[PDB]
A = this chain, B = another copy of it.
Amino acid sequence: AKVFFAADAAIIGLMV
């Protein structure tokens, strides 16, 4: 799967 990154700042990974 792939991990896409984003920020809330706190960094989070969206794993698909």
| B-binding residues in A (CB < 8 A) | 1-8, 10-16
- A14-B12, A16-B16 given as contacts; is B2 within 8 A of A4 (CB)? no
Number of copies: 4
Which of B8, B10, B11, B16 sits near A8, CB closer than 8 Å? B16
Report whether B15 and A14 are in contact in the complex, using a CB–CB cutoff of 8 Å: yes
Residues of B within 8 A of A5 (CB): 6
> How many angstroms from the CA of A4 to the CA of B9 in the assembled complex?
11
Closest 4 CB pairs of A and B: A4-B6, A13-B15, A6-B6, A6-B14
Q: Are A12 and B10 in contact (CB under 8 A)?
A: no
Q: Which residues of B contact A4 (CB under 8 A)?
A: 6-8, 12
